């Protein structure tokens, strides 16, 4: 694993000392080399999981996130290469360093076994994000947004830690697969119930429900492309991975400790998908769509069925990539205009003839057009939920419909009307942003082709 | 669709518009042009009957009864004119009706060909900046402090010089 | 009716447009610029047919239940290209 980390810990001094004319290219290409080397984990010949020490490990549920992160790093770099163009070399170097620290932390956590290490990394993820969001935004409320982000996250963090302590004491160790081979069952009293809470509350507060979805839009809006990318892609996924790895112990509590959370997740999926219709701000629309899909993820995580877990992982990866892509497109249309509003720029596709086909290929992946990992996940999760009850296809379908609606609303208020006549600032497409779109897409094709990699624990 | 209307209207134009609308809906009801001519002549007689009258009372009464009769005996699916709203060509070509300023961002390897036309753009824009500032004073001098204006636009009271605000009208692409 | 200033503005813009279009014209020499049946039959039926026959007959019929030839529709009397001794007809066909 050091083979993945150490070079990512060398990109930093590399950035510091390299000359301005060359740091961008050098660090970018070498981060791509890191992404490449990050595939050794896929030599999972047999079912014996990979273990490198008492301090690291890998797994089928973690490897995807690792590669996706090591591959979203350079895309953040590139998408962060036209703005802050008049900001000093030292400042842009700081930005690069923060991105790289995010990468390294995310890798170490998605790999680590001991949930306490996982937790310290899960909470160290903040500093770079808070910074990136406050020191490089474009509005004023970014401050309140960062505050909300930080404090939601830490409120979650605390009882999680307290329960990790209670465990480490009652049980002997915290190492995973030992928690498995020596788990037990609980008398199911108010004590163990509040323990279940203090263990899942943080992961949920992070992966937003209806009740606490508030810090997502502010972040994705006030913050720049890279922060938006990384939020929509991974910093949510951390909660899901933690919940998956930890729920192994709390059996059986999660049968009746789920109804409220499943209910909230579904209702929130619906209401947020509806708001996605009448939400002006494009990035806010995208954020609420992300909420709508992560609600499915959660409803599939709780009930603990194998189909459900595989669908969760599929939809997870798919949404990560697709949201990064949509945010790239938004930023693109913003740098030329400097207004997030959806109804200002209209009737494109007459001057950006190609870009549309990078807009289209995203929506179709949002509304679950097959053959896509998106629909595979949505469908397996709907199957699990139908088994768990026959009266949830209702909500699945309402969500599918409202999505099929607002995805096209977005396509049609930006690439289907008639062109304005005062947007003389429409610098044509840059090879760079076209490349970012292509790189976010192509992997969707290859994974639609061969998804056995992207299944999960149960496959 | 170039000139703009006044705020208020007059009995004259109201009656004219009612007439044209009713005649179109009649062309739609009664297909054959012979029947259309017949009933159009009948409507013309109906109008010429009360034409010479001038009492605002009878005017308003007849107009507001005429509009009700019209709305109650109109054609559900009328005859829309393709090139106008409601039709099957309205905006059909707006997807191709690009403006000019897309030109500037061409690449020189492309405007290499089509050289002549780009030899004349400059002397056109040159025909704009050289006579822009003047087009402002013509209004800022005649921006009557009375402050009660319409949307009309005065011409170049001088000779040789060009009018004001010709860019957003000239260069408007074709209809095709 | 039209006001005279309006008529004059119209004349100006009309004589401007009727020159802008004369301009948007383009002279010549711009745009500047620096058996087949059998060949198509070949390149669009044959080659793919070869590749696909390879695929089928050496990767698909070489696997347990890739292709499923529904059982043929035998009749009475119909003999068999295998051993398949003769088969019997039915009984009386009155009327």
């Amino acid at each position: 694993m050091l083979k993945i980390i150490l070079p990512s810990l060398m990109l930093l001094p590399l950035t510091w000392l390299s000359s301005p004319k060359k740091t961008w290219t050098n660090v970018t290409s070498y981060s791509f080399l890191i992404s490449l080397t990050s595939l050794t984990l896929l030599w999972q010949t047999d079912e014996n999981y990979k273990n490198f020490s008492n301090m690291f490990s890998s797994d089928p549920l973690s490897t995807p996130l690792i590669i996706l992160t090591a591959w979203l790093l350079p895309l953040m770099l590139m998408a962060s290469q036209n703005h802050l163009k008049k900001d000093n070399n030292v400042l842009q170097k700081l930005y690069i360093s923060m991105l790289i620290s995010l990468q390294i932390l995310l890798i170490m956590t998605f790999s680590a076994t001991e949930l306490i290490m996982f937790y310290i990394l899960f909470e160290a993820t903040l500093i770079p994000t808070l910074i990136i969001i406050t020191r490089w935004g474009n509005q004023t409320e970014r401050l309140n947004a960062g505050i909300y982000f930080l404090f939601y996250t830490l409120i979650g963090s605390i009882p999680l830690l307290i329960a990790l302590i209670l465990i480490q004491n009652h049980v002997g160790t915290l190492n995973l697969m030992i928690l498995s081979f020596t788990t037990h069952t609980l008398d199911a009293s108010w004590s163990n119930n509040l323990l279940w809470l203090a263990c899942m509350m943080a992961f949920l507060i992070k992966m937003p429900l209806y009740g606490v979805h508030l810090w997502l839009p502010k972040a994705h809006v006030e913050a720049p492309i890279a922060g938006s990318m990384i939020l929509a892609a991974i910093l949510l996924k951390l909660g899901s991975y933690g919940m998956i790895r930890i729920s192994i112990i709390l059996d059986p509590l999660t049968k009746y400790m789920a109804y409220p959370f499943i209910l909230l997740s579904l209702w929130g999926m619906i209401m947020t998908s509806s708001i996605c219709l009448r939400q002006t701000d494009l990035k806010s629309l995208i954020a609420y769509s992300s909420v709508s899909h992560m609600a499915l993820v959660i409803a599939s995580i709780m009930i603990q069925t194998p189909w459900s877990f595989m669908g969760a992982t599929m939809l997870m990866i798919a949404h990560g990539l697709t949201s990064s892509l949509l945010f790239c497109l938004a930023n693109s249309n913003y740098e030329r205009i400097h207004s997030r509003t959806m109804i200002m720029a209209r009737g494109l596709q007459m001057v950006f003839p190609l870009m549309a086909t990078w807009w289209l290929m995203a929506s179709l992946a949002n509304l679950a057009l097959p053959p896509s990992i998106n629909l595979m996940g949505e469908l397996f999760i709907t199957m699990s939920l139908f088994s768990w009850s026959n009266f949830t296809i209702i909500l699945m379908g309402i969500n599918i419909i409202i999505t099929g609606m607002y995805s096209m609303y977005m396509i049609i208020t930006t690439q289907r009307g008639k062109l304005t006549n005062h947007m003389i600032n429409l610098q044509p497409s840059h090879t760079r942003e076209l490349t970012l779109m292509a790189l976010h897409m192509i992997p969707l094709i290859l994974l639609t082709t061969s998804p056995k990699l992207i299944t999960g624990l149960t496959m | 669709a170039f000139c703009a209307p006044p705020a208020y209207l007059t009995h004259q134009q109201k009656v004219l518009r009612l007439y044209k609308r009713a005649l179109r809906h009649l062309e739609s009801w009664c297909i054959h042009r012979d029947k259309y001519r017949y009933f159009a002549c009948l409507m013309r007689a109906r109008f010429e009957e009360h034409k010479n009258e001038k009492d605002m009372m009878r005017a308003t009464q007849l107009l507001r009864e005429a509009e009700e009769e019209f709305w109650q005996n109109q054609h559900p699916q009328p005859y829309i004119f393709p090139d106008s709203p409601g039709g099957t060509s309205f905006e059909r070509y707006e997807c191709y009706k690009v403006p000019e300023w897309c030109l500037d961002y061409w690449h020189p390897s492309e405007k290499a060909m089509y050289p002549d036309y780009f030899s004349k753009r400059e002397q056109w824009k040159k025909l704009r900046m050289e006579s822009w500032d003047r087009e402002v004073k013509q209004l800022q001098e005649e921006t009557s402090p009375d402050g009660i204006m319409t949307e009309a636009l005065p011409p170049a009271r001088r000779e040789g010089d060009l009018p004001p605000l010709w860019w957003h009208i000239v260069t408007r692409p074709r209809e095709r | 009716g039209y006001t005279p200033d309006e008529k004059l503005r119209l004349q100006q813009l009309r004589e401007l447009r009727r020159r802008w279009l004369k301009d948007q014209e383009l002279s010549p020499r711009e745009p500047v610029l620096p058996y087949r049946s059998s060949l198509f039959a070949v390149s669009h039926v044959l080659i793919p047919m070869w590749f696909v026959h390879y695929y089928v007959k050496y990767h698909m019929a070489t696997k347990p239940y890739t292709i499923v030839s529904s059982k043929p529709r035998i009749f009475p009397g119909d003999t068999i290209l295998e051993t398949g001794e003769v088969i019997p007809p039915m009984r009386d066909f009155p009327d």
Binding site: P428, H430 | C102, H107, E110 | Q24
Partner: peptide, 11 residues
């Protein structure tokens, strides 16, 4: 034989 306005397309 007339012109046809269009965007860049080279990029």
């Amino acid at each position: 034989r007339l012109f046809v306005v269009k965007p860049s397309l080279y990029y």
